[PDB]
Amino acid sequence: LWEMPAEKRIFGAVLLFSWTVYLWETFLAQRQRRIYKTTTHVPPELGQIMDSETFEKSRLYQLDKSTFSFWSGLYSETEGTLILLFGGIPYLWRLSGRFCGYAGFGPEYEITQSLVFLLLATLFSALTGLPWSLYNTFVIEEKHGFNQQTLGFFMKDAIKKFVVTQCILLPVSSLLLYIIKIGGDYFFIYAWLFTLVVSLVLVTIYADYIAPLFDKFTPLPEGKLKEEIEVMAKSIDFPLTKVYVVEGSKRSSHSNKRIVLFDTLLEEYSVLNKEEIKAKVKNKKQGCKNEEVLAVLGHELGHWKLGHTVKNIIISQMNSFLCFFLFAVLIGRKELFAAFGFYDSQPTLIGLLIIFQFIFSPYNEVLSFCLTVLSRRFEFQADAFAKKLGKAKDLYSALIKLNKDNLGFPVSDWLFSMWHYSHPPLLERLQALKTMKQSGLEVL
Numbered sequence: 001l002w003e004m005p006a007e008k009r010i011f012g013a014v015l016l017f018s019w020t021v022y023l024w025e026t027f028l029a030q031r032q033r034r035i036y037k038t039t040t041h042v043p044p045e046l047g048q049i050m051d052s053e054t055f056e057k058s059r060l061y062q063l064d065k066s067t068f069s070f071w072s073g074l075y076s077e078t079e080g081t082l083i084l085l086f087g088g089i090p091y092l093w094r095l096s097g098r099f100c101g102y103a104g105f106g107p108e109y110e111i112t113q114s115l116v117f118l119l120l121a122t123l124f125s126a127l128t129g130l131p132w133s134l135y136n137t138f139v140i141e142e143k144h145g146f147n148q149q150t151l152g153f154f155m156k157d158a159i160k161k162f163v164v165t166q167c168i169l170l171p172v173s174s175l176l177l178y179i180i181k182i183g184g185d186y187f188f189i190y191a192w193l194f195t196l197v198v199s200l201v202l203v204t205i206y207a208d209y210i211a212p213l214f215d216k217f218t219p220l221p222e223g224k225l226k227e228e229i230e231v232m233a234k235s236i237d238f239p240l241t242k243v244y245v246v247e248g249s250k251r252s253s254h255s256n257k258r259i260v261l262f263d264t265l266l267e268e269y270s271v272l273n274k275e276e277i278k279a280k281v282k283n284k285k286q287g288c289k290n291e292e293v294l295a296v297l298g299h300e301l302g303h304w305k306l307g308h309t310v311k312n313i314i315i316s317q318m319n320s321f322l323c324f325f326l327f328a329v330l331i332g333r334k335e336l337f338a339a340f341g342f343y344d345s346q347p348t349l350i351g352l353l354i355i356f357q358f359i360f361s362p363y364n365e366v367l368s369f370c371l372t373v374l375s376r377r378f379e380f381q382a383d384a385f386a387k388k389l390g391k392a393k394d395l396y397s398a399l400i401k402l403n404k405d406n407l408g409f410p411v412s413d414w415l416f417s418m419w420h421y422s423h424p425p426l427l428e429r430l431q432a433l434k435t436m437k438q439s440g441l442e443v444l
């Protein structure tokens with residue numbers, strides 16, 4: 001192994017790391033699936049939190065998602081393994097060159113060929129994802145009562161998302177690739193700065209110019225909820241401007257500056273809210289009453305007051321800086337390219353692909369995991385901020401009702417949930433909302 005050629009050590013290590021992660025995640029998923037199969041009546045830590053009918057409905061939902069997840073993750077690991085072993089990436093590259101030369105563009109036009117590759121690669125991935133997304137939407141989600149869309153809506157939506165993605169992706173990619181080629185030895189600072197500016201622009205225009213292409217937004221109607229939101233926002237110096245409702249119910253009954261609220265979150269504005277004896281119980285409808293929406297807003301506004309959003313932005317740009325720096329260190333190493341079937345050329349984009357996705361693999365995994373732990377910490381802090389606003393009782397209630405409307409299963413394997421859950425389990429959140437309050441607490 002030591003004496004194995006570097007190009008073989010590189011390829012082998014990327015592929016073995018892939019398989020290792022996949023086996024670790026298959027192991028974890030099995031432990032969680034076992035809980036769905038095993039935990040067949042409500043535990044006593046939970047009598048007050050779910051009734052037996054909702055519990056079975058959630059267990060059955062989550063178990064179908066888990067089975068679908070096993071097959072998706074097996075197909076995805078196989079497809080990736082086979083692409084790597086049989087050179088699908090050099091193949092698609094050479095195929096992109098072939099399109100270029102029948103349009104009169106020779107190999108010297110590398111960025112052009114790169115943009116063709118970007119189009120085909122994203123198309124391929126879009127196409128191979130489509131059977132799975134259709135099955136999840138029109139079998140799993142349909143079966144358990146959540147899907148609201150037709151196939152025609154689904155396909156209209158998919159094409160529009162793909163087109164809009166290309167409209168932004170390709171021009172931005174031609175420039176970033178140019179910048180990389182024309183800077184140096186400090187090109188990576190300008191590469192980093194350009195991606196920061198693109199990221200800033202995109203985030204600044206998304207609400208007005210991209211989001212309304214895909215969803216219907218309407219102002220929250222005048223009433224008691226609109227006014228309590230305004231009071232709360234003032235109370236924390238939040239410069240609330242307008243409250244909008246997004247008609248998520250065009251897609252799904254699931255429920256999740258400006259404030260935007262899903263209509264499925266709102267008992268009295270959900271579009272989806274608008275028999276042998278009882279009949280009456282068939283009045284159990286979706287969304288949260290107003291005092292619950294407010295506590296959830298209290299939580300969301302905690303992410304703002306506590307500066308979590310600013311911390312996430314800083315983390316992502318420091319990470320982006322670090323990766324562009326290391327890309328600069330590594331991109332002259334011709335063995336990295338040869339590992340993946342690029343012998344006669346070292347295209348810049350192929351370089352980004354290999355270094356950011358393959359070589360940086362272990363760092364990407366460690367960082368994902370670190371961000372997941374941090375996320376859990378921020379969620380407890382946002383819950384605690386709503387407690388501090390005086391809304392613990394309503395947030396407690398809110399989390400139970402949303403868990404029910406979305407059929408969350410509130411028992412999890414501790415290892416699976418440590419690895420995967422960006423929000424702490426429901427029961428851990430409810431216990432935290434029950435604790436005491438405040439005095440001096442100056443016992444540092």
Ligand SMILES: CCCCCCCCOCCOCCOCCOCCO
Pocket residue numbers: 064067068071131132135139140143
């Ligand atoms: C290459 C295309 C692959 C197509 C995707 C199939 C995904 C397989 O997952 C199936 C397992 O879970 C599905 C559960 O939903 C069906 C419920 O059937 C009714 C049982 O009462």
Ligand SMILES: CCCCCCCCOCCOCCOCCOCCO
Pocket residue numbers: 019020022023077078081
């Ligand atoms: C020679 C080292 C192999 C030890 C780890 C086994 C990896 C198995 O994971 C495969 C899972 O993905 C399905 C597609 O890959 C099938 C080939 O795996 C064979 C591993 O030699």
Ligand SMILES: CCCCCCCCOCCOCCOCCOCCO
Pocket residue numbers: 196199200203303308309310312313316317371374375378
């Ligand atoms: C993990 C805690 C989740 C709660 C807060 C979510 C905050 C969103 O953070 C994601 C930010 O990433 C997008 C990058 O934005 C680019 C802005 O560019 C910087 C301009 O100076």
Ligand SMILES: [Zn+2]
Pocket residue numbers: 299300303378379382
């Ligand atoms: Zn939160």
